[PDB]
Amino acid sequence: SGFRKMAFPSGKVEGCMVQVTCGTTTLNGLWLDDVVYCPRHVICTSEDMLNPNYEDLLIRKSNHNFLVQAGNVQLRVIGHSMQNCVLKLKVDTANPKTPKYKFVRIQPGQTFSVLACYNGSPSGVYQCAMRHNFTIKGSFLNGSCGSVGFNIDYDCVSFCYMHHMELPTGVHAGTDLEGNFYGPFVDRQTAQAAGTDTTITVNVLAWLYAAVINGDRWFLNRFTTTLNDFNLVAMKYNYEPLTQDHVDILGPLSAQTGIAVLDMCASLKELLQNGMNGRTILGSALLEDEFTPFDVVRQCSGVTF
Known part of the structure; x- marks a missing residue:
C-alpha cells in the first residue's frame, strides 16, 4: 500500500517527441504518423508575440522554413497547415514508434501526465489536473512549449494537452491537440488573468x-x-x-x-x-x-x- 502522486510510464510518448525550429525559434513537436504537431507561435519572434497576426506571419513561411529534427536525424517537411493554434507539419516519413493514440479534450478536474521536454528531448514527467479556471499548475521553463499531456489506457495514448503559454501569475495555459485553447486564453503576450481557482x-x-x-x-x-x-x-x-x-x-x-x-x-x-x-x-x-x-x-x- 501507500499512496503517491504517480504519472503514467512515458516511454510511448518519449518516442514521439521531436524538435521544431522555424527561423530563430525552437520548441517541441509531437510526431504521430507522418504529421508533426506543434504550437503555431513557433513562427513568431519575441516581438511578434506582443501582437501576432498568425495568418500573415505564415505567408512568409514555406515547407523548408520548418526544420524538424528527431535525434540527429532530419525529417523532410512536405506540407504544412494551421489548425486553430497548432501547426501540422506533414513529413515524408511515418514515425515508426507511433503508438496507438487518440486526441481528447478533457473536462476540468480530469488529470493527465505531462512529459516536459526541451529541444525535442524529454526532461521529466509529472501529474497535472485541468483546473476549473482552465489553467494547470505545471513546471515549464523556456523551450518547453509543445510538451504534451496525456493518459494511457493499456495500449492507447490519449493526448489531451499541448503547452503554449505561461501567464504573468506563473500558471500555465495551452491547447488540446486540435489547437483549441483550454479556457479563454490566447497565444499572445498580453495581460491575461485567470479566474477563481475552485477546488475539485x-x-x-x-x-x-x-x-x-x-x-x-x-x-x-x-x-x-x-x-x-x-x-x-x-x-x-x-x-x-x-x-x-x-x-x-x-x-x-x-x-x-x-x-x-x-x-x-x-x-x-x-x-x-x-x-x-x-x-x-x-x-x-x-x-x-x-x-x-x-x-x-x-x-x-x-x-x-
Missing part, C-alpha cells in the same frame, strides 16, 4: 477515500450531511458544488470502504470548518484535489498498461 470537490473526496483505504482515518467523524447542506459550506470555501453524478462516480470507493459518500462529505465539511489542527492526511498538510476517483481506483488495484 469530487477529487478531494476520492483522496479521502484513498487515505481511509491506507489507514489514515482520524478525520472520520460521527456526522452525515445532505448535498445541499454540504454545498452551502463548499460555496464559502470556493469548492465545486457536488452533484449526484459525482456521488455516483464515488460509488465503487464507498462500497469498498463501507463509508457512504454523504458521510465522507460531512468529514470534509468539518475539515474545511475546523482545519487539520496541524495533522496530516496521506503525508499532506492540506486537502489534495488532483487525484480523480479513477486515479484512486488505479493505485488501489494496480492497473497496468
Whole structure:
C-alpha cells in the first residue's frame, strides 16, 4: 500500500517527441504518423508575440522554413497547415514508434501526465489536473512549449494537452491537440488573468477515500450531511458544488470502504470548518484535489498498461 502522486510510464510518448525550429525559434513537436504537431507561435519572434497576426506571419513561411529534427536525424517537411493554434507539419516519413493514440479534450478536474521536454528531448514527467479556471499548475521553463499531456489506457495514448503559454501569475495555459485553447486564453503576450481557482470537490473526496483505504482515518467523524447542506459550506470555501453524478462516480470507493459518500462529505465539511489542527492526511498538510476517483481506483488495484 501507500499512496503517491504517480504519472503514467512515458516511454510511448518519449518516442514521439521531436524538435521544431522555424527561423530563430525552437520548441517541441509531437510526431504521430507522418504529421508533426506543434504550437503555431513557433513562427513568431519575441516581438511578434506582443501582437501576432498568425495568418500573415505564415505567408512568409514555406515547407523548408520548418526544420524538424528527431535525434540527429532530419525529417523532410512536405506540407504544412494551421489548425486553430497548432501547426501540422506533414513529413515524408511515418514515425515508426507511433503508438496507438487518440486526441481528447478533457473536462476540468480530469488529470493527465505531462512529459516536459526541451529541444525535442524529454526532461521529466509529472501529474497535472485541468483546473476549473482552465489553467494547470505545471513546471515549464523556456523551450518547453509543445510538451504534451496525456493518459494511457493499456495500449492507447490519449493526448489531451499541448503547452503554449505561461501567464504573468506563473500558471500555465495551452491547447488540446486540435489547437483549441483550454479556457479563454490566447497565444499572445498580453495581460491575461485567470479566474477563481475552485477546488475539485469530487477529487478531494476520492483522496479521502484513498487515505481511509491506507489507514489514515482520524478525520472520520460521527456526522452525515445532505448535498445541499454540504454545498452551502463548499460555496464559502470556493469548492465545486457536488452533484449526484459525482456521488455516483464515488460509488465503487464507498462500497469498498463501507463509508457512504454523504458521510465522507460531512468529514470534509468539518475539515474545511475546523482545519487539520496541524495533522496530516496521506503525508499532506492540506486537502489534495488532483487525484480523480479513477486515479484512486488505479493505485488501489494496480492497473497496468
